[PDB]
């Protein structure tokens, strides 16, 4: 694509520079180019890809929510709706781009639990972002696509990873947010976050000081949601 003439290692190096410069659109374009080189991604490289697009779509989601709120207040000219639609279309395009990378061909080449769960969690997340703005005939199919990706990731993580694994914990965190915010299943959300937290607590004794810090950090996010939800 646009990055076809740059070396893979240079794209990775520039993605790291872009992160330091808080240039997340550049970071995402560099990591998209790195993926399209066709080689599998290392653990660090998967994190760079995820951080880049999470930041980009995070800004789009925040803008979309501001404009949707203004739009709803007005419905109590066409410009607010038109501009919300513009931002919404741009967000959908980014989500489709990420889902395209996972489908061509990150997921099918990911055989290790850590990589496969990571990519399937991503797939659930970006379908969840599509679901946040969906209204029409595909809202249910988009929701089920998120659910299916999260569920496959959960099944693998429960079989292949310890209960304190940060990716396993963050997957459960986001799947619980999916249940609460998207699927209208707050009891499922609360149950998942509680069981995830409790099983991680019982496994903390196996960890080094650094792994303990990594796991307890995500466990606090589960606790924060439980405090909000109960």
């Amino acid at each position: 694509g646009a990055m076809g003439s740059m070396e893979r290692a240079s794209l990775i190096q520039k993605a790291k520079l872009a992160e330091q410069a808080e240039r997340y659109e550049d970071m995402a374009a560099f990591m998209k180019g790195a993926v399209e080189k066709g080689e599998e991604l290392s653990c660090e490289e998967r994190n760079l890809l995820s951080v880049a697009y999470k930041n980009v779509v995070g800004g789009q989601r925040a803008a979309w929510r501001v404009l949707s709120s203004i739009e709803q207040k007005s419905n109590e000219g066409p410009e607010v709706r038109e501009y919300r639609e513009k931002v919404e279309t741009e967000l959908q395009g980014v989500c489709d781009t990420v889902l395209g990378l996972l489908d061509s061909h990150l997921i099918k080449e990911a055989g290790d639990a850590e990589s496969r769960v990571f990519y399937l969690k991503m797939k659930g997340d970006y379908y969840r972002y599509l679901a946040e703005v969906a209204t029409g005939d595909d809202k249910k199919r988009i929701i089920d696509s998120a659910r299916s990706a999260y569920q496959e990731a959960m099944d693998i993580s429960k079989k292949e990873m310890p209960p304190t694994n940060p990716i396993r914990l963050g997957l459960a965190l986001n799947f619980s947010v999916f249940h609460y915010e998207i699927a209208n299943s707050p009891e499922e959300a609360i149950s998942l976050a509680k069981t995830t937290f409790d099983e991680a607590m019982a496994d903390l004794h196996t960890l080094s000081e650094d792994s303990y810090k990594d796991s307890t950090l995500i466990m606090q996010l589960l606790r924060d949601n439980l405090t909000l939800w109960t």
């Binding site: 760079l48 951080v51 930041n55 965190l173 986001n174 915010e181 995500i218 996010l221 949601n225 909000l228």
Partner: peptide, 9 residues
């Protein structure tokens, strides 16, 4: 409800 912040790495 907070998801993974995942904005820094």
């Amino acid at each position: 409800a907070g998801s993974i912040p995942g904005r820094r790495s």
